Design a protein around this nucleic acid. Structure first.
Lengths: 129, 83, 149, 83, 185
RNA sequence: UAAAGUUGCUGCAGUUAAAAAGCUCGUAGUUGGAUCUUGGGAGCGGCCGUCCCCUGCUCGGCGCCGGCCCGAAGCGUUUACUUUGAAAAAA
């Protein structure tokens, strides 16, 4: 069945980007999906998305640009210390110049670069470049 | 593509499809920069200034190249919003 | 897809966005509850009560008119039966199949469909035991399953 | 077509699409004011009735159950009601 | 008067003057039996955008549904008593904070942040019921809720839209726009 | 040992090269939908970025005319996670 909702959403916008679509519907809305997307938005990879409340799990429409090379999930949510975060960004990102690894910390769902600033490790959700 | 000093260091800045925002390689030979002529709105004649839309091969063989130029001209005030 | 079938059907109901009672319906929550009590005492199930209501008494959902759903309304008064109605119908179906197998021992496809109904009963049985609405020492016993109509 | 307005679909498109698959999930059923010619009063029948809908004291049978939208007895008028 | 605060504190003459106005509508006008039992908690005046004022009257939750039966007719009398002001009715809903590690019974989801903020939004507009919510996340990360209201009671409530945005902006801090979708219902 | 992504967690394979049980059920095992704190009050730098705040109940000290402001020991869901600290022989 559907088990990882964030996984479904990220692959859905990945398959939409590859085709060259201008906006994509991602059917189950979580909180973790919105946070991931806001983190991608703040680095300019996607445009202003919007969530659609039916009195259920909502849907999200994301306005895609052509900036997102790939948007991936890491399953399971491995638990990353600050020491390990370099070895994840070495084998999961193309360059050391661009690309991000979003991970849920106690502070909140944020990129590896903000996790280094705040001095807080956490569980990996996925990545985008 | 600055270094630490600020120097622009790469040897050419490649074009980028106006429809998909995906860069157009040195050997994507199905690309098309299409120039659309402008109009002196009172006369209806060629001015000399023109709008330039680039499209990558991928969208052209995808069959979406006309609808992309249709949106780009409508989003430029060439085609009527009505349409 | 389906549990014990290869079928992948998309046949469910679709509740409307607006949870508000409509303008036309004048029936008070009390009147609906008193009608639910009149239907339940007539020997009827929350599935059937919901149907009989939304057909000939123009009531979208009981949960929209009242604050609460139908089995909870039967439970709050004390009209809801001891074991749940969906587990009742599975046991009733299983008894009817196991009754069919008392004459037709060659019917290997009935025997296969019995093992599926058996599997669905044991599967609810363990669910209702976790939610503590069945006693833990309950058991689907095919000898005394016929005793329960 | 790449750029579909998924935010704002035309009503024709959502009326076409499956009830569950619409941008916002919406039922295709409805309630209707039905009256038989013998009795005064108007009973609210559900479109997809799936039961033999009787009037008060069985003046007549109103609605016979079918696959989908239940058939109303010949001589029974209906108005679908909305809010 | 009918101004019945849960705390042991007096109002201003503003809130007592509103309770006096609803005692006048009891004693003088026809809607007396359906206002005896009905009581009021608090009220406030807020500066809404432009040269307009928005008046908000809080209500107890169990009697709110009795207030729902008498809303728009009672709004008319306050609409002709206070000349250039828009009167709106919210239920004063008690709100519980999230139970933290640091900090007794289970927190009920009726008394939660989102349910109360959505019930407040539902009760801002009685003549119009909400037909769809669309939460735009703008490029700076800041949200903008878009409430789609019914075409039935459009003209009756359309002038109060510019008010409603400001009334919701005050209590929650959520920048809300209101639209009228035409094509579904 | 690397080369061996030829043991594959990173990271392999299984239509035809070696490879998916004949099929289904099924208990451990493994993995499991959405949903329950948010908007602000205050200051600095040139609308934005970092900073301070959104639990109560014995004895004391910034004290005041039994109470209030403040500190100390204790009581205050359970973990996992992460961060810090203690500790951990040398070679």
């Amino acid at each position: 069945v559907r088990m990882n909702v964030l996984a479904d959403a990220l692959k859905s916008i990945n398959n939409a980007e590859k085709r060259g679509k201008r906006q994509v519907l991602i059917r189950p809305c979580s909180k973790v999906i919105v946070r991931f997307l806001t983190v991608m938005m703040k680095h300019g990879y996607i445009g202003e998305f919007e969530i659609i409340d039916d009195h259920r799990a909502g849907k999200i429409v994301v306005n895609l640009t052509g900036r997102l090379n790939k948007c991936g999930v890491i399953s399971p949510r491995f638990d990353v210390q600050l020491k390990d975060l370099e070895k994840w960004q070495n084998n999961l990102l193309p360059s050391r110049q661009f690309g991000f690894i979003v991970l849920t910390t106690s502070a909140g769902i944020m990129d590896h670069e903000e996790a280094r600033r705040k001095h807080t490790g956490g569980k990996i959700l996925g990545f985008f470049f | 593509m600055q270094s630490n000093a600020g120097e622009f260091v790469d040897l050419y800045v490649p074009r980028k499809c106006s429809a998909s925002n995906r860069i157009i390689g040195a050997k994507d030979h199905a690309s098309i920069p299409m120039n659309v002529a402008e109009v002196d709105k009172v006369t209806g004649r060629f001015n000399g200034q023109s709008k330039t839309y680039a499209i990558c091969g991928a969208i052209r063989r995808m069959g979406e190249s006309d609808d992309s130029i249709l949106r780009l001209a409508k989003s430029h005030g060439i085609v009527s919003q009505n349409f | 897809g389906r549990m014990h079938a290869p079928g992948k059907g998309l046949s469910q109901s679709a509740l409307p966005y607006r949870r508000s009672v409509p303008t036309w319906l004048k029936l008070t929550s009390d009147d609906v509850k008193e009608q639910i009590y009149k239907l339940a005492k007539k020997g009827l199930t929350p599935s059937q009560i919901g149907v009989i209501l939304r057909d000939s008494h123009g009531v979208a959902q009981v949960r929209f008119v009242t604050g609460n759903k139908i089995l909870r309304i039967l439970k709050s008064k004390g009209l809801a039966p001891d074991l749940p109605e969906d587990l009742y119908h599975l046991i009733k179906k299983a008894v009817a199949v196991r009754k069919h197998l008392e004459r037709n021992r060659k019917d290997k496809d009935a025997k296969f469909r019995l093992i599926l109904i058996e599997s669905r009963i044991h599967r609810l049985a363990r669910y209702y035991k976790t939610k503590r609405v069945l006693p833990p020492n309950w058991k689907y016993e095919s000898s005394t399953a016929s005793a329960l109509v | 077509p790449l750029a579909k307005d998924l935010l704002h679909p035309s009503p024709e498109e959502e009326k076409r699409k499956h009830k569950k698959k619409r941008l916002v999930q919406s039922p295709n059923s409805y309630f209707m004011d039905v009256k038989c010619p013998g009795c005064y009063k108007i009973t609210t029948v559900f479109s997809h009735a799936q039961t033999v809908v009787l009037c008060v004291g069985c003046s007549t049978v109103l609605c016979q159950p079918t696959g989908g939208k239940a058939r109303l007895t010949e001589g029974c008028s209906f108005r679908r009601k909305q809010h | 008067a009918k101004i019945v605060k849960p705390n042991g504190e007096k109002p201003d003459e503003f809130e007592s003057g509103i309770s006096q106005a609803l005692l006048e509508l009891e004693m003088n006008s026809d809607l007396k039996a359906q206002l005896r039992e009905l009581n009021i908690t608090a009220a406030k005046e807020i500066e809404v955008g432009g040269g307009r004022k928005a008046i908000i009257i809080f209500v107890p939750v169990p009697q709110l549904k009795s207030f729902q039966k008498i809303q728009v007719r009672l709004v008319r009398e306050l609409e002709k008593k206070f000349s250039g002001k828009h009167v709106v009715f919210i239920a004063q809903r008690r709100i519980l904070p999230k139970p933290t590690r640091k900090s007794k019974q289970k927190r009920p989801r009726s008394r939660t942040l989102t349910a109360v903020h959505d019930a407040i939004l539902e009760d801002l507009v009685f003549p119009s019921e909400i037909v769809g919510k669309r939460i735009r996340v703008k490029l700076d990360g800041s949200r903008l809720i878009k409430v789609h209201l019914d075409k039935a009671q459009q003209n009756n409530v359309e002038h109060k839209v510019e008010t409603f945005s400001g009334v919701y902006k005050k209590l929650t801090g959520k920048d809300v726009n209101f639209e009228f979708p035409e094509f579904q219902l």
